[PDB]
Design a protein around this nucleic acid. Structure first.
Length: 48
RNA sequence: GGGGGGGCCGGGCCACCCCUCCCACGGCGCGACCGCUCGGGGCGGACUGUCCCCAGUGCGCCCCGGGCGGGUCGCGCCGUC
């Protein structure tokens, strides 16, 4: 350690940059999920 | 004599009447740019109805189309003791 302390950080550039996080759902995609329910509820229970 | 008056000048500057330019402002007309927000396609991918297709919603980017619109810039015409 005491004859060469210097760091030589490994070079880094390969990544293809995919996104395997999960993105934030937009306004209108929440805005229809209700009215996408409540048409699955209404239609369903206006039979039986 | 007094009073009154006409004069005796060339020149233009301003500018009435006939010509022709440079700006400013407006109007109308067109052109370019920026913007908003509406349609078709391509890709990324959300949601549910639907077996899917499709339907309803609509997000990221790329390609095309349309409607309105403020501002900026460019041009065309009409108006302005």
């Amino acid at each position: 350690i005491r004859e060469n302390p210097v760091y030589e950080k490994k070079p880094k550039k390969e990544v293809k940059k995919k996104r395997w996080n999960r993105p934030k759902m937009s306004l209108a995609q929440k805005k229809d999920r209700v009215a996408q329910k409540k048409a699955s509820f209404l239609r369903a229970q206006e039979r039986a």
